[PDB]
Design a protein around this ligand. Structure first.
Ligand SMILES: CC(C)=CCN1Cc2cc(Cl)cc3[nH]c(=S)n(c23)C[C@@H]1C
Lengths: 427, 558
């Protein structure tokens, strides 16, 4: 509406042009799901139609954010971000609450609908150019530019930051114990009160946001007595390593003792503290892969000493804020996914196994894509940034079906490793 | 005159200034001729004179063209062009025929010199001033400047095709029943109006376009019955690529080997079989486009087999949103596979192939997928939907690949239909070591410096052996050593590998590879009843692997 305001003059990093990514081709059910949106979005005055003189681009996708609810836009702002907010990571860097991880219960709300007010300098709008396609490059597509705050951008919560610190004041007064990290377009609010009480404090905030500045939270629940959207009730206080346990086979068949001695040695790299010698000695002797072999007493000590040494962790559990973090996921079996956020090999800051049995809706390009967001929220909470992934998937298959299952608001940068496993065992 | 259209702001690159491409004094016989054609463009108002406060310049050459009954003008601003800002990409994307639906009639209109009907930013015209002398040594500058989208300038094509789409906006509203598609300077209009009834609209539009400079003298829309565009050939209900002439001769050089493997590939959009493994295989000849290439016996087999096909031509049908796109994939060659898409019973819509250039050892069930995949990725792109797939493969085969393959793969709609080389698993390894079976502690290395080592193995029952193999290198030996364990062994054998590569390759249950060293293992795994590959690393204090490690010293002292 007619309620203009001051523009935080926005700019680029040194010596660079705007994103010029190219618009990936999308479905028919989708090319429309955006025409409508964007076309509401011009009346609304948020976006405008542009001309040739503007040659930048950013992919626009389309999804259904609530168990397949209503079509919603999702600009891939991955490339204009680097091209601006990296120099803006410093200028308006929304600070990271390292205690949030500790709160026994977390909740995440979509304060993104808010940015929707602050106008953008018409000296930067140029670069948020985006493009909606057509079925067979028949129609040259509809070209838009942004006039409010590109809601995908890593430099928008930053601009509209003051406005939030403000809208959040009395909440902090009243309850000066809840943490509130404001990453991208979400607000993680962490309390440490009774299972249901954490939720309480939240309906509250979802409400104090409301009445005040038209920033709107999302209606997590009503009376809806159905098993849909259990809830984003995170609890960042749990994360420990142990199912990289050695199968204790009281039937130490050679084959068994073979693989075992095997794994054990790779560990030498992840855990410099390993000495599998006199155990190897037990397999020394061409024998049938189905017999017993449990001798070298001193070696057996090596079996306990290692079994227990696996509990006292690596040096590399040190976060180095100038190191982009890498997440690697691994099809461990049927449903059971796995991953390990590291920064320098074997020095891994975090591990865990994403679980969702096949038979149900086993779309592998689901359990992972789902396991790519969980793993990626697990990092907003913790390290306050998203990890570049290594995805056990064909570039294409993923580039085809990521956007279906992506319910999220941001997009971690990624890479697909056609490179096999050694690790996909039980880890 | 000039079509009064909302002008669009073109600029030069930041910090940069307009052209000063001065020019070598022109041909008097063609300099006057510059005035006798410019004056027409100047009175046509496209060219206006100035001289004092605008310093910039560029090159006004002059030339003649196809069946020229008149002299032509020329001024490429490829200097200014690079000093001109960057625009929106003219058009990346070609409406590949097969996607098109049938419209009852489709004229094609020349969009004449619609570049000059459109105007140029009243500022960005200063950087367009050109210069014409008069006598080798006589008249002081006869300087002109542009007012309308010049004929070679980074932006014209776009500023232009922007303008037109604006200029066709009203008509495209009132007429939401007659499709248009610009093309450089052409316009394909295509209604469902019956001949003439259609003629009513071309005429209206023709007049519409006539109002804001888009003069369309394509009289009652001149429209050659067939359509060559982008090398296509389009008819009211069919498309193709007609003149594909696989040449035939003796010296088949890289340059022509390429060209030969171009047309061939192209042809595949519609020709139900065109193979291109062989010719492409050798086609990897580097730097010698001009140097002749010995078209090999199998590369010959391909070449004309295709000719057989490519003589009996094919008609491609147009899309129709009444039916789901259907997909058939059958394997024709070795790396080779084929797919053709239809929705109706049997006249073709689209055809294509998927040949593997993965690296060196790809599986077959996997290999169906990658093909399948390519098609989804292609249908999405053209028809905006997704062929229901029909594939030569029980699910019994498919579902066993994902439940056990590492990388994941997702499979949309797909129905099974029996055909010839049924896609399946030939050999399937175990989980647990086969009980009691002769455990082979294999090994096979070779010196880096001496390509010649010795594969061989050692069983539980003191049963050694070894084979001297020349022209080898560790890799080619740890596999060779497996094969041997797969030869002097029962129908249910366990095997211990030093290597990984080896255990890698076999462990992935691959089938074809082009070499006999790997290949022979496959046909040993196939005929078998129960292999069991297994890995324990070299010199890992593994005395069990130590012997296999020291065994070979009967062919090298160290
Ligand atoms: C492929 C090109 C330049 C198309 C332009 N063009 C003309 C055309 C020609 C044939 Cl034979 C079938 C066609 N089917 C459709 S839809 N079109 C069409 C419309 C567009 C407007």
């Amino acid at each position: 509406p007619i309620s203009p305001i001051e523009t935080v003059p926005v700019k680029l990093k040194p010596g660079m042009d705007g994103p010029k990514v190219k618009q990936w081709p999308l479905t028919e059910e989708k090319i429309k799901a955006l025409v409508e949106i964007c076309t509401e979005m011009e009346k609304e005055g948020k976006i405008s139609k542009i001309g040739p003189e503007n040659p930048y681009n950013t992919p626009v996708f389309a999804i259904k954010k609530k168990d397949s609810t209503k079509w919603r836009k999702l600009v891939d702002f991955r490339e204009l971000n680097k091209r601006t907010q990296d120099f803006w990571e410093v200028q308006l860097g929304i600070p990271h609450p390292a205690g949030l991880k500790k709160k026994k219960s977390v909740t995440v709300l979509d304060v993104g609908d808010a940015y929707f007010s602050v106008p953008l300098d018409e000296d930067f709008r140029k670069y948020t150019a985006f493009t909606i396609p057509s079925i067979n490059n028949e129609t040259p597509g509809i070209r838009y530019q942004y006039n409010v705050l590109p809601q995908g951008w890593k430099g928008s919560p930053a601009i509209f930051q003051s406005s939030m610190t403000k809208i959040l004041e009395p909440f902090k007064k009243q309850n000066p114990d809840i943490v509130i990290y404001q990453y991208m377009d979400d607000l993680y609010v962490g309390s440490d009160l009774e299972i249901g009480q954490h939720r309480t404090k939240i309906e509250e905030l979802r409400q104090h946001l409301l009445r005040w500045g038209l920033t709107t939270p999302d209606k997590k629940h009503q009376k809806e007595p159905p098993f849909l959207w259990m809830g984003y009730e995170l609890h960042p206080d749990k994360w420990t390593v142990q199912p990289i346990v050695l199968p204790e086979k009281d039937s130490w068949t050679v084959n068994d003792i073979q693989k075992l001695v095997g794994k054990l040695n790779w560990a030498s790299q992840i855990y410099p503290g390993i000495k599998v010698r006199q155990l190897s000695k037990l397999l020394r002797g061409t024998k049938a892969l189905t017999e017993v072999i449990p001798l070298t007493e001193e070696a057996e000590l090596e079996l306990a000493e290692n079994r227990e040494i696996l509990k006292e962790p690596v040096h590399g559990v040190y976060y180095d804020p100038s190191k982009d973090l890498i997440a690697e996921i691994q099809k461990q079996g049927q449903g059971q996914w796995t991953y390990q956020i590291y920064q320098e090999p074997f020095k891994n800051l975090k591990t865990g196994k994403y679980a969702r049995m096949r038979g149900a809706h086993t779309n592998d390009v689901k359990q992972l894509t789902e396991a790519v967001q969980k793993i990626t929220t697990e990092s907003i909470v913790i390290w306050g940034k998203t990890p570049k992934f290594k995805l056990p998937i064909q570039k294409e298959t993923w580039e085809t079906w990521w956007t279906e299952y992506w319910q999220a608001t941001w997009i971690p940068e990624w890479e697909f490793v056609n490179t096999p496993p050694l690790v996909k065992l039980w880890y | 005159p000039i079509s009064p259209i909302e002008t669009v702001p073109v600029k030069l690159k930041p910090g940069m200034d307009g052209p000063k491409v001065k020019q070598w004094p022109l041909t008097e016989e063609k300099i006057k001729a510059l005035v006798e054609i410019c004056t027409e463009m100047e009175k046509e108002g496209k060219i206006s004179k100035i001289g004092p406060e605008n310093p910039y310049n560029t090159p006004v050459f002059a030339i003649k063209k196809k069946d020229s009954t008149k002299w032509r003008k020329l001024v490429d601003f490829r200097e200014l062009n690079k000093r001109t800002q960057d625009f929106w990409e003219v058009q990346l994307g070609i409406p590949h025929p097969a996607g098109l639906k049938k419209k009852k009639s489709v004229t094609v209109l020349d969009v004449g010199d619609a570049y000059f009907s459109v105007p140029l930013d009243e500022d960005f015209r200063k950087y367009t001033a050109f210069t014409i002398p008069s006598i080798n040594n006589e008249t002081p500058g006869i300087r002109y400047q542009y007012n309308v989208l010049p004929q070679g300038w980074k932006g014209s094509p776009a500023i232009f095709q922007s303008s037109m789409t604006k200029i066709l906006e009203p008509f495209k509203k009132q007429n939401p029943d007659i499709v248009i598609y610009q093309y450089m300077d052409d316009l394909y209009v295509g209604s469902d109006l019956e001949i003439g009834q259609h003629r009513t609209k071309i005429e209206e539009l023709r007049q519409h376009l006539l109002r804001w400079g888009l003069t369309t003298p394509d009289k009652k829309h001149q429209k050659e019955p067939p359509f060559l565009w982008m090398g296509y050939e389009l008819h009211p209900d069919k498309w193709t690529v007609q003149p594909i002439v696989l040449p035939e001769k003796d010296s088949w050089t890289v340059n022509d080997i390429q060209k030969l493997v171009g047309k061939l590939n192209w042809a595949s959009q519609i020709y139900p079989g065109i193979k291109v493994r062989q010719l492409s295989k050798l086609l990897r000849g580097t730097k010698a486009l001009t140097e002749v290439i010995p078209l090999t016996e199998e590369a010959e087999l391909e070449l004309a087999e295709n000719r057989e096909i490519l003589k009996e031509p094919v008609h491609g049908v147009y899309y129709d949103p009444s039916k789901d796109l259907i997909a058939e994939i059958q394997k024709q060659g070795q790396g080779q596979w084929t797919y053709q898409i239809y929705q109706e019973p049997f006249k073709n819509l689209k055809t294509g192939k998927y040949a593997r250039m993965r690296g060196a050892h790809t599986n077959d069930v996997k290999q169906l997928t990658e093909a399948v995949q390519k098609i989804t990725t292609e249908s999405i792109v053209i028809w905006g939907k997704t062929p229901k797939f029909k594939l030569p493969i029980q699910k019994e085969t498919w579902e066993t690949w994902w439940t056990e393959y590492w990388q994941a793969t997702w499979i949309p709609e797909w129905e099974f239909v029996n055909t010839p080389p049924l896609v399946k698993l030939w050999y399937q390894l175990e989980k647990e070591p086969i009980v009691g079976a002769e455990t082979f502690y294999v090994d096979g290395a070779a010196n880096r410096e001496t390509k010649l080592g010795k594969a061989g193995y050692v069983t539980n029952k003191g049963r050694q052996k070894v084979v001297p193999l020349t022209n080898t290198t560790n890799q080619k030996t740890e596999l060779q050593a497996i094969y041997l364990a797969l030869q002097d062994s029962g129908l249910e054998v366990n095997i211990v590998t030093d290597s990984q590569y080896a255990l890698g390759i076999i462990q992935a249950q691959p089938d074809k590879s082009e070499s006999e060293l790997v290949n022979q293992i496959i046909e040993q795994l196939i005929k078998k009843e129960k292999v069991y590959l297994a890995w324990v690393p070299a010199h890992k204090g593994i005395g069990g692997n130590e012997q296999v490690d020291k065994l070979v010293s009967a062919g090298i002292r160290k």
